[PDB]
Structures are given as structure tokens and as C-alpha cells.
Amino acid sequence: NLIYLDLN
Amino acid sequence: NLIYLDLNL
Amino acid sequence: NLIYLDLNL
Amino acid sequence: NLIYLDLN
Amino acid sequence: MSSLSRELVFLILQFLDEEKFKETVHKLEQESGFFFNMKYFEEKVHAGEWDEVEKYLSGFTKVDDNRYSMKIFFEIRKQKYLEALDRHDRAKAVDILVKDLKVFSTFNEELYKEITQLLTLENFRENEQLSKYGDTKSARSIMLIELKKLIEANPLFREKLVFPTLKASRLRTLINQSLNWQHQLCKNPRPNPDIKTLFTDHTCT
Amino acid sequence: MSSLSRELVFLILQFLDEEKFKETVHKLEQESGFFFNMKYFEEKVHAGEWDEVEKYLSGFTKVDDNRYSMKIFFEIRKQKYLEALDRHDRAKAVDILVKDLKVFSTFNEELYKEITQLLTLENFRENEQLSKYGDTKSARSIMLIELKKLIEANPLFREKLVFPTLKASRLRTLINQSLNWQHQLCKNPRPNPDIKTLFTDHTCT
Amino acid sequence: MSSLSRELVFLILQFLDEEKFKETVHKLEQESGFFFNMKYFEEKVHAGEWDEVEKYLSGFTKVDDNRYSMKIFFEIRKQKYLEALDRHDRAKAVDILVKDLKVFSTFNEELYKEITQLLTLENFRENEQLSKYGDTKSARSIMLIELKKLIEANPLFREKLVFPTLKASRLRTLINQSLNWQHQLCKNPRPDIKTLFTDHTCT
Amino acid sequence: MSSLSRELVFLILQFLDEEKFKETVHKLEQESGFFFNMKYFEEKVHAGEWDEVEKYLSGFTKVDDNRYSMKIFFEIRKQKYLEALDRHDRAKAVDILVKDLKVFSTFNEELYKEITQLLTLENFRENEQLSKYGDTKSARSIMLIELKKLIEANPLFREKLVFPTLKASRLRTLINQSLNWQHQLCKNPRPDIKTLFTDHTCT
Ligand SMILES: [Zn+2]
Ligand SMILES: [Zn+2]
Ligand SMILES: [Zn+2]
Ligand SMILES: [Zn+2]
């Protein structure tokens, strides 16, 4: 339910 | 009615 | 001094 | 200059 | 008071008036309670001189002497209260309400409340009973109408509204007779005699 | 004014006094300006009735008639100002300062400033000139001392402080002579004659 | 998603409190509206800080949202009014009575009249309903008890009274993870972290 | 070390502003004392919000720290006083003159007397030194100009006027790095991050 950016 | 002293006699 | 009108004559 | 914990 | 003393007060009232000692006339009117000056009363009401107006009334009646005098003081104080609201001095208006108007609550709790509620109004014309208030002058004029009715019907004023008719300067006339009496006791001429003072009896010698 | 009219006012002053019309006596004293009542003045000062005190003074002098009367009004107003500070009513004190005391600034700018500065004090006894102020009553008593000096030296009071000596009820005596004069013109007996009124001349018939 | 932002506010709240930034904590609680600090509300009411008490409430509810909130604002403004009467500042009490209490007239015309009529009394304890309330400390306490019930019953406050259970300094801990994740890419280590403002590098 | 905490405050400041938590930003600026927001100070002065203007200043300096700060507080309280005179509230002006301006008497006895004597004037523009100042908007503006110079010259404000250059939302970015560093340990992935409150796991 949370914004998550996978880098990378 | 009024008070009155005679002043001769 | 005072004003005075005589009242016989 | 900053506190840094290396885990592990 | 003797009837002599009472009548002498009236002569003095006529004198002071003719000599134009205006404030002394109305103080004597008030203190003696013998004569109520309508003309004066109206003038003070128009000027809105409430302290003087009530003080002048205090020579003739207290606030709870009868329902007329009561409605008289109430009308006056109510207007004083309204004027304080119309200058938006709500600090004075409350002061008036507690110190001047609360005495009327004993006799009518509900009227005091309804008038208290006028504090919380944006404008007291929102009250339909008071919607009729225009300018100060008109309000004072309207209320004076009512006041003259209350006064003329008040049994403690009813026989005090008409000044005893007399020839002008009656007191001066009497004084002149006193000078005639004193001089007629002298044992010398002549007409055009010198009168040195009113303080001690005149003599010729 | 005639000297007759002037003396008649003095008789009237004696009458009203004897008949105990107290407020009417002092209004007539003020309005006529003929006699200044020290006893009255002191009493009003102790009571701190400043409005009445100034009003009574207004019959005799204006604020700028001379340096005596000036220092008189200044002393009175300054105390009024101090009392307002001592009840911590700094709202009234400023009102006093602008409306009553500013007239003195024209004549002395620096004294007005030094007295203005008393507003910002925690207590005006911090000023060494005013360190001497104890209680109200003592302050009024101290200042009355100064006032009586100022008044007695004031050329506009100097010859107005002593009431003309006369036998008691002089006016009543004169009135009685008027009754004697009127009756002596009648053409009938008898002693114990009835006097109906002072308003119109008495007759026997 | 947006609960990222909401949760991050709670981490900041915890951080601010641990850093003893007391005023900043409660402004945030209020502006975010996420958490109602009853302990703080109790304090300020006891201190009679009515303007702040009302301003803090305003991040959670308006006077006319529901009957609970309205009774809360009413009791607050009533007591504020009475206290003015108790110090004989009848001028302030009038100001209160028009500016703060007039809104409740619409909903109860007679109660506004009755409370107005407390001005005319030498002491408001002449009224039988109010013959009870003294001194101020006790009344506040009695009021606080009622205010607490009103708040804990108010729908707009139900799930805002319990702070999430967290380990101490969660944010600092996360900031550390961020530094680890920066340092793990360094090519290579080496612990001389220069700033949080830009990612750290080793060379 | 402690600059971790100081820097983290700046990240929070930036976060709070991006979230439009305006009141919380400036309380923090003040309580931390790390950054003086001149743009905000300018605003409030134009609005004549003197109590808030003074309260904001109080996180940076006291009235008697140095001659610059004292002249700042003086000008603020002078103008506050004059404005009361201009609305003919001579009661408020007296209150101001004793409670706010009296502290400056010690340092200049005569200037306090001179400003006191402005009460007695029908209009303070009768004084030649003050015959100049109207209307309020302009005076504030003229005052703001001087206040700005005083602040930018004040030692206690030198390095507190420029906000650090940062990429937008630095904190959110760091929070992401923390989530990456949590997810990289999962055994194994799988992106269904449940909270920031406890470290995420995958199973
Ligand atoms: Zn003769
Ligand atoms: Zn006869
Ligand atoms: Zn590295
Ligand atoms: Zn995972």
C-alpha cells in the first residue's frame, strides 16, 4: 500500500 | 395665616 | 444709593 | 561527520 | 414650613428668575419641591442631561413612589441605555443596565430580561418593539411626549405645574414698602432721602 | 446690578441658609459671585467632588485669570490625576491628562512632560517630588492647605471671603415691615389682623 | 501510496517529540489532523489557554460538524465567559457573549437568553443552575472530564486518539538504512559520511 | 553526529513545505532556530501580526542579545504603539508603552520620555520627528526595509538566511532507499510494502 521505487 | 409682629402700640 | 419709590404724598 | 551504523 | 416661609420662597423664585440666576432658580425649585418647571425639564431632556434631569426629579419624587414616577425614571434610564448602544459603547451600556435599570427587575423580571437581551444585538432595531427608533433627537422628542403625560398624571406633580400668578418683582415691591416703613419712623425731612443699606434700618439724622 | 439688588441677594443668601436650602445657597453664591464659601470649598475638596469644586470656582474665576487661580486649578486637576493612577485606572488618568491638564502645557511645557512621565511608573512615589503622597485623605488635606493659601492671596477672592454681618433673618424682618406698612394703610381695626398672603397687598374690610 | 505520506508524518511526530520540539509537534498534529494529543489538550485546558485550545481543535473539527463538537465548543466558550464574570470583567464577558457564544443562539434561542442574563447578576451563583461552579480549577477539571467524554464519543475523533506503537526513533533508523544503501554502492569502502543532502560516495 | 539531527530537520522543513503544512514549517524554523524565513517575516510584518512576529524572532534572539536585535524589537514595538495612537486607542498605547517599551528606558532614559509624550498630542504628527509616518502600509514597508538590514547585519542571523540547496523531496527519496535496503534482504522477492513502522519482509 506504499509507493516503492525499485532502483533498479 | 402668616406670622405678623405688630411694630407700634 | 438704593432705589426708593416714595408711596405717599 | 554523521552517525553511521554499518549493518553489518 | 410656615405659609409665610412658603410664599417667601415663591417671591424669591420670581426674583432669581428676573435677575436671571437660572441655575439657582432650578436648584431652589428642586430643593423646595414647591414648583416643577416643565419648560426646564423638556430642555434638559432634549439635551440628554440625564444626571441633572434625575436630580431635578429627586426634589419631587423617588423612583418607587408610584407607578407613574416609576415609568418616568424607567423611560429616562432606558433611553440612556439605548444611546450607549447606538454609540457602540457596550461597556457603558452594561454599567447602566446593572446600576440604573436593575431596580425595575424586582417589579418586572421579564421586562428587565427582554431589555438585557438587547446587548447581544447587532442593532437594537432588530427588536420590533424598538424598530421605531430613528435618530437621537427624535427618540428624545417621542419619549418627552410620554414623559409629559406621566408627569401631568402623577399625583405628586399634578398640583405643582402652574406657577402662582403675581405682579412682576413682588419681592422688590415688598422691600420698597419696608423702606417706606423705616423712613416713616424718622423725625426729619426730606423726600429723596438717602437709603444707605437694606442691612440695617434706615434713619434720618 | 443695583446696590439694592446686590444687597437683596445677600439677604436671600441668609434666608436660604437659615431655611437650610444648602444646594441653593451655594448655587447662588457661585452664580452671583458675591461670596465665596470656604467651609463649603474645604468640604467638597475632602470629599473629592472635583466637578462640583471646579463648577463652584467658575463663579469667581477662569483658569487663566491669574497665576493664583491657575495654580489652584492645576493642583486640583493634578490630584484628580494622581488618584486615578492610585486606583490603577490608567485609562481615566490619560483622559484627565489630555482633557484637563494640557491647558497648563502652553504655560509650562516641561512640567506637563514630567507629569506625563508618571504614567509609566509602577508607583508614582518613585518620583521623589511625589514620594510624599500617603493616603488619599492626607493628600487632599495637604493640598487643601495650599489651596486656602492660593485663594486668600488671589485678588479675585481676597475681598469675597467674609460674609456681611447682619442680624438673623433680616429678610423676614423686612417682610414684616412690609406687612406693617400695608396694614397701616387700612381703615379698620384690629391688632391680630389676618394676613392672607404676601402675594397681594393686605387690606382690612 | 498516500499512506506513505501519512505514516511519514507519524515518524516525524515521534522525531519531533524526541527532539523536544514541543510546539512543532502539536501544530503538526493539528495541521495534519492525524492525531489528537489528549494529554496536551488536558494541559492547555487546565491552563485555560482557550485560544490555543480552540485553534488546536480546529485542525480536527468545526463548531457545527456534529452535536458532539458543538457541545465541546459551547462548554469551552461558556467557561471562558464565566471566568470573565468571576474577575468582574463584565466588558470581556460581553465580548465573549457576542463574538463566541452567539452562534449557539440559532440552535437554542432561550439558552442564549438565559446565559446573557448572568451579566445582570451581582454573582452568577445566584442562578440555581450555576450556583455550583467554584473555584475555577475545579470547574475546569469537571469540564475537562465532560470534554474528554465528548471527544472520545465524537466520530471525528474516534481513530485519532491512539498513537501508533513504534520503536524509538524510527525515522533515524530509516535514515541509517538509506546511508547503508548509499554506501553499499560505493566502489568501494572504507564511513566518512559528509551529508544527508546528497548521496554519499567513496573515492 | 549532531549534524545528522540538524540536517534531518532541514529535510523535514522541506517535506513540511512540500506538504503545505505552513504553520508547522515556521514553528520548526523557530524552535530549531536553524533557519530564518525572511519571506515569512516580511509577510507577517505587513500583516502587522506583532505577537507572532515577536514569537518567531524569539527562537533566534532575545531583546538584549546585541544592539541589532534590540533595535529590531524597538522598531517593532514603536510601530505597534503608534498604530494604537492612529486608531485613537490611547488605552492600548499606554499598555504597549509600559509592558513592551519600558525595557528600552534603561538604555535611553530620554527617548522613552519623548515617546511617552506622544500620548498627549492630538495627533503624533505634531512631533517633527514623527510628522512623516503615514499611512500604516507605507510605514510598515519603510520599517520592513530597515528591519531587513538590521537582520541581515545581526550576527545571530548571518548564516541562517539561506536555505540549503536540495533536490525536491530529499526525505521521501531517502525513505525509498530505506525500503530498498529492507527489500534487498527479503529471502526473496516478489513490492507489497505494508508499512514504514516496521521493516518489510517477503514471505
Ligand atoms: Zn428717613
Ligand atoms: Zn389691616
Ligand atoms: Zn562509501
Ligand atoms: Zn520483499
Beta carbons of C5 and E195 less than 8 Å apart: no
Cα(G19)–Cα(G14) distance, integer angstroms:
9
Cα F19 to middle of ligand 1, angstroms = 31
Pick left, alpha or beta for residue E165 (phi over 0 → left; psi -120 to 50 → alpha; otherwise beta). Answer: beta
User: What is the total residue count of chain E?
Assistant: 205
Among the listed residues E182, E37, E173, E30, the one whose alpha carbon sits nearest the alpha carbon of residue F198: E173
Select from G91, G105, G116 the Cβ nearest to the Cβ of E116. G116
* Full residue range of the structural domain in which residue E14 is found: 1-165
In a domain, G196, yes or no: no
Neighboring chains of C (3 or more beta-carbon pairs < 8 A): E, F
The answer to whether chain A touches chain E by having 3 or more C-beta pairs less than 8 angstroms apart is no
Residue F140: helix, strand or coil by DSSP? helix
In a domain, G99, yes or no: yes
Task: Decide if H175 touches G, using CB distance below 8 A.
Answer: yes
Half-sphere exposure of G199 (CA within 13 A, CB side): 16
In a domain, F182, yes or no: no
| Chain A hits for H193, Cβ within 8 Å | 1-2, 4
- Residue H91 is given by DSSP the state H
- Residue E192 is given by DSSP the state S
Cα(E85)–Cα(E94) distance, integer angstroms:
9
Handedness of CA G38, G40, G43, G45 (dihedral sign): negative
Pick left, alpha or beta for residue F60 (phi over 0 → left; psi -120 to 50 → alpha; otherwise beta). Answer: alpha
| Chain G hits for E113, Cβ within 8 Å | 113, 117
Question: What nine digits make up the cell of E179?
Answer: 423702606
The ligand minimizing its distance to the Cα of E190 is 1
Give the residue from chain E lying closest to B4, CA to CA. Answer: E4
User: How many domains does the structure of chain F reveal?
Assistant: 1
Task: Decide if D8 touches G, using CB distance below 8 A.
Answer: no
In a domain, F196, yes or no: no
Residues 85-144 of E with CB under 8 A from G: 90-91, 94, 97-98, 102, 105, 112-113, 116-117, 119-120
Cα(G53)–Cα(G41) distance, integer angstroms:
7
The neighbour count for residue H146, using CB atoms within 10 Å, is 12
In a domain, H32, yes or no: yes
Residue keyed to cell 426708593: C4
In a domain, F71, yes or no: yes
| Chain C hits for F7, Cβ within 8 Å | 2
Beta carbons of F177 and B7 less than 8 Å apart: yes
Q: Experimental method used, please? A: X-ray
In a domain, F62, yes or no: yes
Question: What nine digits make up the cell of E198?
Answer: 437694606
Contact (CB, 8 A) for F16 and F170: no
Q: At what angle do helices F90-99 and H90-99 cross, to 10 degrees?
A: 120
Mention every residue, 6+ apart, whose C-beta is less than 8 A from residue H114: none
In a domain, E131, yes or no: yes
Beta carbons of D5 and G176 less than 8 Å apart: yes
